[PDB]
mmCIF file of C-alpha atoms and ligand atoms in Angstrom:
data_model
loop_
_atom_site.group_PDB
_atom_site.id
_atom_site.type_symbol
_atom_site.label_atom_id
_atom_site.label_comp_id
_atom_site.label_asym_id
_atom_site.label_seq_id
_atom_site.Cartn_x
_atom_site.Cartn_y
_atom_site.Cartn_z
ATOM 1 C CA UNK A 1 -18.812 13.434 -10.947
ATOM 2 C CA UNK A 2 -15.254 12.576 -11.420
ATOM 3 C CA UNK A 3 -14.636 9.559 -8.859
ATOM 4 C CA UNK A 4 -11.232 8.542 -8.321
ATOM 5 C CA UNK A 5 -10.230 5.620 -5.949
ATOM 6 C CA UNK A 6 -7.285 6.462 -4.166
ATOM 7 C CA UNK A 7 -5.468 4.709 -1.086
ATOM 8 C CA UNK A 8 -3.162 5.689 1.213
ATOM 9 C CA UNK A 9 -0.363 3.362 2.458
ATOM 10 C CA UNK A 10 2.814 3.931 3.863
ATOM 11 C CA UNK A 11 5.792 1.596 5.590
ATOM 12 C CA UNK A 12 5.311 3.752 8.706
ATOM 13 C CA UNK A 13 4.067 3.103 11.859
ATOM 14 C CA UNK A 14 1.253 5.404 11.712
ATOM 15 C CA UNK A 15 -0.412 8.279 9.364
ATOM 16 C CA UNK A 16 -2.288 6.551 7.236
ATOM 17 C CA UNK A 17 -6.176 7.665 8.670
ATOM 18 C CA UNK A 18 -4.425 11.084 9.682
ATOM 19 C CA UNK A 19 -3.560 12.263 6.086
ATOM 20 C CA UNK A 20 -6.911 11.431 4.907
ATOM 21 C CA UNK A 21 -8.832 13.082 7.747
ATOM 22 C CA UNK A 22 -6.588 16.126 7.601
ATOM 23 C CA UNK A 23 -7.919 17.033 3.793
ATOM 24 C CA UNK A 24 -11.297 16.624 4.922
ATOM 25 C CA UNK A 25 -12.147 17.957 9.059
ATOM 26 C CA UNK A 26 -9.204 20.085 8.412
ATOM 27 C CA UNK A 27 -7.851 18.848 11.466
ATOM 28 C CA UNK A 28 -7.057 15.844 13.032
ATOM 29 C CA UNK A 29 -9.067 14.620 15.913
ATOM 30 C CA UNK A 30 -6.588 11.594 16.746
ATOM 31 C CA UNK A 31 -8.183 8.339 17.748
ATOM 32 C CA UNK A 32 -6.359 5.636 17.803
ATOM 33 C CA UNK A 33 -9.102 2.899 17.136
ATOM 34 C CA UNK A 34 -8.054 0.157 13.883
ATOM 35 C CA UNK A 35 -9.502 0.737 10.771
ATOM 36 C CA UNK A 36 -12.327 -1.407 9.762
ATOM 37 C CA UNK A 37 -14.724 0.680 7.299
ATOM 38 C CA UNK A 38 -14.154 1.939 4.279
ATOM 39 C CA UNK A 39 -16.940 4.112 2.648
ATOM 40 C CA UNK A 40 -15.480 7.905 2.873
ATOM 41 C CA UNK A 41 -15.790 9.669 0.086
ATOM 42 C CA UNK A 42 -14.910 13.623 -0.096
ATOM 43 C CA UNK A 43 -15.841 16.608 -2.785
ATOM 44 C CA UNK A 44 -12.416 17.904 -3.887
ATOM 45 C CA UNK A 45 -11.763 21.388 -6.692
ATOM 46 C CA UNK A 46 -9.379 20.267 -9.395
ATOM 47 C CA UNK A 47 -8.910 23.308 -12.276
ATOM 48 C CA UNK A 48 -12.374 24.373 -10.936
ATOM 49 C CA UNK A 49 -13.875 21.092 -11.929
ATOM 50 C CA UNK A 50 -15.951 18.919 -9.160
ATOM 51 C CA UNK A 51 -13.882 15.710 -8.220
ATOM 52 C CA UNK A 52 -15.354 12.734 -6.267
ATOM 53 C CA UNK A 53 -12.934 11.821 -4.417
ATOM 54 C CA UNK A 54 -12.642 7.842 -2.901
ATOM 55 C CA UNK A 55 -10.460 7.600 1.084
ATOM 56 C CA UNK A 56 -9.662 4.266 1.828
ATOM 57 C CA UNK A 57 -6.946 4.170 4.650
ATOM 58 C CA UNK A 58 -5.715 0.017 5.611
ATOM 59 C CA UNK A 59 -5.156 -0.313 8.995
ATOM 60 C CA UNK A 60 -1.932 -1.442 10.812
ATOM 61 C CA UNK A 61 -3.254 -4.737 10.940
ATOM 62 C CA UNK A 62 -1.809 -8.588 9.123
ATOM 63 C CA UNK A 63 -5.103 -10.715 10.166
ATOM 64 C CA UNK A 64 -7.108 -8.248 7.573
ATOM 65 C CA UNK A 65 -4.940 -9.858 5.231
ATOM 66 C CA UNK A 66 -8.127 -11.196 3.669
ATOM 67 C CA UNK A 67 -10.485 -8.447 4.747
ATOM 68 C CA UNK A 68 -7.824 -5.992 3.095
ATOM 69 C CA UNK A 69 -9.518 -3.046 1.027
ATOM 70 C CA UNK A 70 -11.032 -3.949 -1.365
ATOM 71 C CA UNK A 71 -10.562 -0.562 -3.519
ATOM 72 C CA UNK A 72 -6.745 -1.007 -3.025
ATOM 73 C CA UNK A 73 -7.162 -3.463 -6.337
ATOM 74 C CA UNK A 74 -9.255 -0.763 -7.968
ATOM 75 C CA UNK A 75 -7.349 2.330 -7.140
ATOM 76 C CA UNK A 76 -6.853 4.371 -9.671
ATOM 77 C CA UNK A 77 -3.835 5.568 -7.815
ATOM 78 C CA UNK A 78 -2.229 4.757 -4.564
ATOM 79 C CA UNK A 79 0.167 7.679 -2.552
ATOM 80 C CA UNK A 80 3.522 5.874 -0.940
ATOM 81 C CA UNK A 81 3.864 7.789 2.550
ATOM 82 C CA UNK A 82 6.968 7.542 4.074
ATOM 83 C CA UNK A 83 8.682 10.080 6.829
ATOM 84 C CA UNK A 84 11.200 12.464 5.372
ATOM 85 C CA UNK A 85 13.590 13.215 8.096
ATOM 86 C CA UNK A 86 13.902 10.140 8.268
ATOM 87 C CA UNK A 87 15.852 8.265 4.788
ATOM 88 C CA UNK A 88 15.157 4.258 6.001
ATOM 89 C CA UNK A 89 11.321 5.124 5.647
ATOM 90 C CA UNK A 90 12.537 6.492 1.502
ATOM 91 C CA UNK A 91 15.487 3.716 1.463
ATOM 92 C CA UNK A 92 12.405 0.811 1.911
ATOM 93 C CA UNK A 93 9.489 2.651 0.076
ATOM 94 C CA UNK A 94 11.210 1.881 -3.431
ATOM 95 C CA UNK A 95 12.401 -1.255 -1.848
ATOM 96 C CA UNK A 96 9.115 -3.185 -0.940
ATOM 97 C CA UNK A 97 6.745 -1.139 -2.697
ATOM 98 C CA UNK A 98 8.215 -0.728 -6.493
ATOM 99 C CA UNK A 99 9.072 -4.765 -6.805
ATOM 100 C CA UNK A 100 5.202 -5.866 -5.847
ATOM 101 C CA UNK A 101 3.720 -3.115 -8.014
ATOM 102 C CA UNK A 102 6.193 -4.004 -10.960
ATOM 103 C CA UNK A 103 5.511 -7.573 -10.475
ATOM 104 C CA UNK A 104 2.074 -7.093 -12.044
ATOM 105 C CA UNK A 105 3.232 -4.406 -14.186
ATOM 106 C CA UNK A 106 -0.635 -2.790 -13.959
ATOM 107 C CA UNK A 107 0.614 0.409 -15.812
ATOM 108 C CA UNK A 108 -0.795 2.512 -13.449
ATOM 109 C CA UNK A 109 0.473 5.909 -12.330
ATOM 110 C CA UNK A 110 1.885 6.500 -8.495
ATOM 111 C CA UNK A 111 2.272 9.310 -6.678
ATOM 112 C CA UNK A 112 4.463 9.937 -3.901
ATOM 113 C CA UNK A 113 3.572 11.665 -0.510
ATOM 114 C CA UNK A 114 5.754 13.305 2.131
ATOM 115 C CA UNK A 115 3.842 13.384 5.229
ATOM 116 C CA UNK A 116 5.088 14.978 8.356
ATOM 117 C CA UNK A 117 6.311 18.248 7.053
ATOM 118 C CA UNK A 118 5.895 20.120 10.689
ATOM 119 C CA UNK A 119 8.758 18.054 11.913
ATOM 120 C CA UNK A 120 10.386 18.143 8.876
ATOM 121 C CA UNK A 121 11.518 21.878 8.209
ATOM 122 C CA UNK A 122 11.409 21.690 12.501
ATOM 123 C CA UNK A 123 15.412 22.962 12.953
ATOM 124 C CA UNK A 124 15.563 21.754 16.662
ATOM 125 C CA UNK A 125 13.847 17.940 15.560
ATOM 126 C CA UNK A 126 16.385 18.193 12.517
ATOM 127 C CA UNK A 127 19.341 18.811 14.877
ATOM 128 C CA UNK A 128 17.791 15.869 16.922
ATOM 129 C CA UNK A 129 18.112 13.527 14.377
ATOM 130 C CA UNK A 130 21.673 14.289 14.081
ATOM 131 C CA UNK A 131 21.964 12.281 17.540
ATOM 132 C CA UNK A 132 20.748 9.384 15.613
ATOM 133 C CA UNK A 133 22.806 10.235 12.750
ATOM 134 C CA UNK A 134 20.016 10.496 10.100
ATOM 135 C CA UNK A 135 19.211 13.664 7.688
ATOM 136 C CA UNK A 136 15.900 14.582 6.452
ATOM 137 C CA UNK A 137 14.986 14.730 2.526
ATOM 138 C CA UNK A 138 14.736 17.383 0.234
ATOM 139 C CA UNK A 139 13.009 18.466 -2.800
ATOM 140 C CA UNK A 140 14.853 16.795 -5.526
ATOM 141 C CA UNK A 141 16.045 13.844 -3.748
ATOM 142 C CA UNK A 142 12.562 12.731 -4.080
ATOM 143 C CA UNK A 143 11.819 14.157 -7.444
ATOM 144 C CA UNK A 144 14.699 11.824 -8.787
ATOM 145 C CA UNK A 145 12.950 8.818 -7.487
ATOM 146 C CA UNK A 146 9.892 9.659 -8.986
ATOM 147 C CA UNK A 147 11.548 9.255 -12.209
ATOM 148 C CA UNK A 148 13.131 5.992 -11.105
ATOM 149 C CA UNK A 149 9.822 4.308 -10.649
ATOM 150 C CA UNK A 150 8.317 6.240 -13.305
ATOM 151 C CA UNK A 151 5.996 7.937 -10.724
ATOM 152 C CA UNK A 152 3.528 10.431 -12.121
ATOM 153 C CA UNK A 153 4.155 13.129 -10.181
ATOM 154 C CA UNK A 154 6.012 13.740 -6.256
ATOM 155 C CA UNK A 155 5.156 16.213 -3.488
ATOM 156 C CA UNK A 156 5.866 16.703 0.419
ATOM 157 C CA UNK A 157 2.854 18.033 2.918
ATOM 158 C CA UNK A 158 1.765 18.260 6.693
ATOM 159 C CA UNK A 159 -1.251 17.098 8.215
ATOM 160 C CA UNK A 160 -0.888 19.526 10.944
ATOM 161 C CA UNK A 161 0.111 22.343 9.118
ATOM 162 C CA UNK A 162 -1.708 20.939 5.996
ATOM 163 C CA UNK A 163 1.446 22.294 3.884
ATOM 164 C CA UNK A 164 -0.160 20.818 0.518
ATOM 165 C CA UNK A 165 -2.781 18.130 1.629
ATOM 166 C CA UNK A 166 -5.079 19.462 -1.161
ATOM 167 C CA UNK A 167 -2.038 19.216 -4.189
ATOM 168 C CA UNK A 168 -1.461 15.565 -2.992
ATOM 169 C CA UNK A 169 -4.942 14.913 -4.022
ATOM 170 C CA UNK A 170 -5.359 17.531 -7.049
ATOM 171 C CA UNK A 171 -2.495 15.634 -8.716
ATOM 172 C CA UNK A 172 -3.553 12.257 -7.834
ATOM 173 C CA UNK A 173 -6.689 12.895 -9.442
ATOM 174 C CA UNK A 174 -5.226 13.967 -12.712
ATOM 175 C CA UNK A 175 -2.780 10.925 -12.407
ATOM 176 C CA UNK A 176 -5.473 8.548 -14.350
ATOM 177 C CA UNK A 177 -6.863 11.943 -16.099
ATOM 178 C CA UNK A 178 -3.870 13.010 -17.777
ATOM 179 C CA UNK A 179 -1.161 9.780 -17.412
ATOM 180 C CA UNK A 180 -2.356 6.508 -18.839
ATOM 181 C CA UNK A 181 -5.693 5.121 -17.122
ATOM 182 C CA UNK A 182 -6.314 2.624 -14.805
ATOM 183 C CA UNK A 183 -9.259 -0.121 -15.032
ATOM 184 C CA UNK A 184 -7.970 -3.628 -13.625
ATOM 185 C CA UNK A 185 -10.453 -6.521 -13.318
ATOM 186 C CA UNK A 186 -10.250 -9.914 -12.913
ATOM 187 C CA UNK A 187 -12.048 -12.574 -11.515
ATOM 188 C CA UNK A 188 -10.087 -15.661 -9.194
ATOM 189 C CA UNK A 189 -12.979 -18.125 -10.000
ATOM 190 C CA UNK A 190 -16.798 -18.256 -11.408
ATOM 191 C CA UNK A 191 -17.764 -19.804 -7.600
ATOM 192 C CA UNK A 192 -16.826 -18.592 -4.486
ATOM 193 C CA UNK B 1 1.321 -25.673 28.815
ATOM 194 C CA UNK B 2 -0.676 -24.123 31.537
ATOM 195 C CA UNK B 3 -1.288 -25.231 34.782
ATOM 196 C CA UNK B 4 -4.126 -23.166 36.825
ATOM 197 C CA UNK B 5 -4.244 -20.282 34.897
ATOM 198 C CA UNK B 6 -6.367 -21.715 32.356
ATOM 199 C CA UNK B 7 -8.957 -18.642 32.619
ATOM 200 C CA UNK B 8 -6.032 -16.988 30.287
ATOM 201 C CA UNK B 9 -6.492 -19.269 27.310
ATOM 202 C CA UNK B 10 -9.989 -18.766 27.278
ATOM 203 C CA UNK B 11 -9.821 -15.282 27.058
ATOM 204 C CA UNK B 12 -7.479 -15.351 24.275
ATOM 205 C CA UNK B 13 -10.158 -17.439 21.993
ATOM 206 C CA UNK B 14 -12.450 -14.530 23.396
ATOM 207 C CA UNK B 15 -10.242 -12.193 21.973
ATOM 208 C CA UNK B 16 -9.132 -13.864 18.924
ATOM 209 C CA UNK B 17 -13.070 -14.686 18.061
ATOM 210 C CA UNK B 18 -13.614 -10.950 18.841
ATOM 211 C CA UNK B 19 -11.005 -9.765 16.074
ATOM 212 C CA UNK B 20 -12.995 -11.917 13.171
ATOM 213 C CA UNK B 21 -16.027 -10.767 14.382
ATOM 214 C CA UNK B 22 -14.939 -7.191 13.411
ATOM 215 C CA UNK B 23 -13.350 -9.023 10.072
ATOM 216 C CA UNK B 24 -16.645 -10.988 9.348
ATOM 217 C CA UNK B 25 -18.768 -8.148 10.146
ATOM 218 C CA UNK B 26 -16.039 -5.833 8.368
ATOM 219 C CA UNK B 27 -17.267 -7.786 4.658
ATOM 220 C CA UNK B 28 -20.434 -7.896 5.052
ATOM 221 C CA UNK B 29 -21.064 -4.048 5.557
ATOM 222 C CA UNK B 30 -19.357 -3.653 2.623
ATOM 223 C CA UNK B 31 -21.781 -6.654 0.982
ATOM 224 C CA UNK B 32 -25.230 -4.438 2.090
ATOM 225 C CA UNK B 33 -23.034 -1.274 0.585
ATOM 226 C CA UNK B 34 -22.473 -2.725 -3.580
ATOM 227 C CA UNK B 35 -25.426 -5.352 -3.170
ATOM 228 C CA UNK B 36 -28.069 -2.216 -3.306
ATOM 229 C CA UNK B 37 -28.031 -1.750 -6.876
ATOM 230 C CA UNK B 38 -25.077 -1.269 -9.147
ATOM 231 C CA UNK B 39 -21.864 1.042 -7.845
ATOM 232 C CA UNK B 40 -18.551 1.449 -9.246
ATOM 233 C CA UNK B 41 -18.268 -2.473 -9.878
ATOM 234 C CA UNK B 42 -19.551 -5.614 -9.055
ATOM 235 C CA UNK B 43 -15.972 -6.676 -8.480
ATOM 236 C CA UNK B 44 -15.928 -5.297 -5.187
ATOM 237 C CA UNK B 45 -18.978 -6.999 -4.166
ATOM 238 C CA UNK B 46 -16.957 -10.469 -4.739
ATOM 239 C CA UNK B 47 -13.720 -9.416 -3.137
ATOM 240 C CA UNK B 48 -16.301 -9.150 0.076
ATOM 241 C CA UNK B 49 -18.479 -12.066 -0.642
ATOM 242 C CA UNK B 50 -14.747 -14.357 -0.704
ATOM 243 C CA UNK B 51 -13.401 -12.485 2.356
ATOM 244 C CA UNK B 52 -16.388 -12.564 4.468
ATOM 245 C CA UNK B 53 -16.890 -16.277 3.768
ATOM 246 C CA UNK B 54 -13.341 -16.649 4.761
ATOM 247 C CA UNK B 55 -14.145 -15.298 8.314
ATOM 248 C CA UNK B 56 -16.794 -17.002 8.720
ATOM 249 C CA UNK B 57 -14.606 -20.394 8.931
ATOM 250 C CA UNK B 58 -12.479 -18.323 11.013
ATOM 251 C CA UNK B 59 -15.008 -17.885 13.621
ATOM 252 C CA UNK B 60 -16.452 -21.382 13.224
ATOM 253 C CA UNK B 61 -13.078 -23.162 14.293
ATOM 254 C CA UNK B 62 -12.173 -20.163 17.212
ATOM 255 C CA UNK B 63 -15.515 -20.520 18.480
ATOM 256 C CA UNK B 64 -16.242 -24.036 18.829
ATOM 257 C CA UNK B 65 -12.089 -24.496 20.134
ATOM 258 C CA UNK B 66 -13.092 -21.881 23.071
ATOM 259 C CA UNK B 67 -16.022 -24.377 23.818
ATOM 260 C CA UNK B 68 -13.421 -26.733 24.228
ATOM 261 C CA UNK B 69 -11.644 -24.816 26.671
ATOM 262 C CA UNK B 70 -14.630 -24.021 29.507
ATOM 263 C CA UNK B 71 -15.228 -27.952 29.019
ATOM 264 C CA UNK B 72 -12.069 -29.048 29.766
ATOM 265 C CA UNK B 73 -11.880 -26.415 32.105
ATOM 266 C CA UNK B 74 -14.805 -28.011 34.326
ATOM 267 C CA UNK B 75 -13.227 -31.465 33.883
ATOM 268 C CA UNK B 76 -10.001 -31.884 35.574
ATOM 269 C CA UNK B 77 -9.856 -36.239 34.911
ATOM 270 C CA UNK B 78 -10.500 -36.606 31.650
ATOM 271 C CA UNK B 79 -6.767 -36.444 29.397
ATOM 272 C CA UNK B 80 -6.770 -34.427 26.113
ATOM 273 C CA UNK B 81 -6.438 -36.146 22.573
HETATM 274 N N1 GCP C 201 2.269 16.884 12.449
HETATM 275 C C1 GCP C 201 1.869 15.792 11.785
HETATM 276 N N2 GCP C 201 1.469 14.725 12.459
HETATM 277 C C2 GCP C 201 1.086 13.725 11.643
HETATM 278 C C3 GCP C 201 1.072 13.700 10.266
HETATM 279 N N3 GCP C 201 0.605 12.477 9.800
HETATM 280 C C4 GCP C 201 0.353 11.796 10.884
HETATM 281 N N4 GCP C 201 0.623 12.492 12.037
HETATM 282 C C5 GCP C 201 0.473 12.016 13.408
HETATM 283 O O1 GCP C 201 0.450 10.600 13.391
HETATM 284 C C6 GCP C 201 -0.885 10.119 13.713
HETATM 285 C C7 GCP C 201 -1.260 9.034 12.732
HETATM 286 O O2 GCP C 201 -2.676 8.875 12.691
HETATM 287 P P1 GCP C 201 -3.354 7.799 11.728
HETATM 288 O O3 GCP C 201 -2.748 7.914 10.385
HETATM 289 O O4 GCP C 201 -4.825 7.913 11.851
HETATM 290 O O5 GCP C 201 -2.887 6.421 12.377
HETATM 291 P P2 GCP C 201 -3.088 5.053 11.582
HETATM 292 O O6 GCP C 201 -1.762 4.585 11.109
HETATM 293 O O7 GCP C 201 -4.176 5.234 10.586
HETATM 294 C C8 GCP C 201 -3.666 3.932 12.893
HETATM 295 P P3 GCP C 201 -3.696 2.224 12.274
HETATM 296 O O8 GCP C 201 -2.477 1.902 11.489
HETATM 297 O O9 GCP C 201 -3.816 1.318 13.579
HETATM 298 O O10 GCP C 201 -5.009 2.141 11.380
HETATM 299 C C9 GCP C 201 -1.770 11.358 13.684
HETATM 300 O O11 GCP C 201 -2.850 11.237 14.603
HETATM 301 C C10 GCP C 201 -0.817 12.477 14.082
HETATM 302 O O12 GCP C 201 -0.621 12.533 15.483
HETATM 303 C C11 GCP C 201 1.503 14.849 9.555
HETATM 304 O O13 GCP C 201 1.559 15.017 8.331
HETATM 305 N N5 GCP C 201 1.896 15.876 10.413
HETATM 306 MG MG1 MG C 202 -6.063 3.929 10.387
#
């Protein structure tokens, strides 16, 4: 069985658990509890071929600094969530999260996520954010950043209308399938 | 500092000791979960082996510093160091 780590993160305040959940209840049931687990795994079809599939969601939380996932090292591929109709949240995903990734220079592919797609093709919430002057994101404004930071591959969805929750995955898996793999280990010391 | 409302400090080591425990007890689930056997790497099982011990020094210094506070809390003569 084809078992991919993967781990959402985004810069936002929130949407992390929710994009997860969304591929796999099919619906969100909210909750607003922190994030402490991390075993949840779900069965996802890729070219009709069985894909395990590895959710690990971090928490809005700096004291788990040390207690931070501990797949994040391992993932095979991490999505960078970010709100479209709204450019800061695109303006500081290539600004904080290309310069750590870089810094390590792991060779591993990255796909990008656009989460909150209701809101996003939402006319009357567009014409809102006029009032705060800002201007949601289209199509290829995001497709040329993917070939900025060399991301594998870049794609906007919903949780709530689940737009293309299942492609965000689908391609993620075939980012270490296709695109050069992953594997990272190393050890910090022999004793702990 | 605080004058009678030294119930409130308490609390907070309450509250801060709380937050490791779900950090501390956060690891070592995910100990019990690569320690049966051998799944996806042993490298995870060290990441929370070095984390959990971590917390536990976290706890260790909150808890016995929210000692400190009920006992100083009874004794209103002795000074503090
Ligand atoms: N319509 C819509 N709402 C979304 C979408 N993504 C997130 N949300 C909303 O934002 C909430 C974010 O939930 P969630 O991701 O679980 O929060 P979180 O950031 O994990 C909580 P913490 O950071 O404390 O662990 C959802 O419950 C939902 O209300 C999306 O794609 N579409
Ligand atoms: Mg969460």
């Amino acid at each position: 069985m084809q078992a991919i780590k993967c781990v959402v993160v985004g810069d936002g305040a929130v949407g992390k658990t929710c994009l997860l959940i969304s591929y796999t209840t099919n619906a969100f049931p909210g909750e607003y509890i922190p994030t402490v687990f991390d075993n949840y795994s779900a069965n996802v079809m890729v070219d009709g071929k069985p894909v395990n599939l590895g959710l690990w969601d971090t928490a809005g939380l700096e004291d788990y600094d040390r207690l931070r996932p501990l797949s994040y090292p391992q993932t095979d591929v991490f999505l960078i969530c970010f709100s479209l109709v709204s450019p800061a949240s695109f303006e500081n995903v290539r600004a904080k999260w290309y310069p750590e990734v870089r810094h390590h220079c792991p060779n591993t592919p990255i796909i990008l996520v656009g989460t909150k797609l209701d809101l996003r093709d939402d006319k009357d919430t567009i014409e809102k954010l006029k009032e705060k002057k800002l201007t949601p994101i289209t199509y290829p404004q995001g497709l040329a950043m993917a070939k900025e930071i060399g991301a594998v591959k870049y794609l906007e969805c919903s949780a709530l209308t689940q737009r293309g929750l299942k492609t965000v995955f689908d391609e993620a898996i075939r980012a270490v399938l296709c695109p050069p793999p992953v594997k990272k280990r190393k050890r910090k010391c022999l004793l702990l | 500092g605080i004058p009678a409302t030294n119930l409130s400090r308490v609390a907070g080591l309450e509250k801060q000791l709380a937050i490791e425990l779900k950090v501390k007890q956060g690891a070592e689930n995910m100990i019990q979960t690569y320690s049966n056997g051998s799944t996806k790497d042993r490298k995870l099982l060290l990441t929370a082996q070095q984390m959990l011990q971590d917390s536990k020094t976290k706890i260790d210094i909150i808890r016995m510093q929210l000692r400190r506070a009920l006992q100083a809390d009874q004794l209103e003569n002795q000074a503090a160091p």
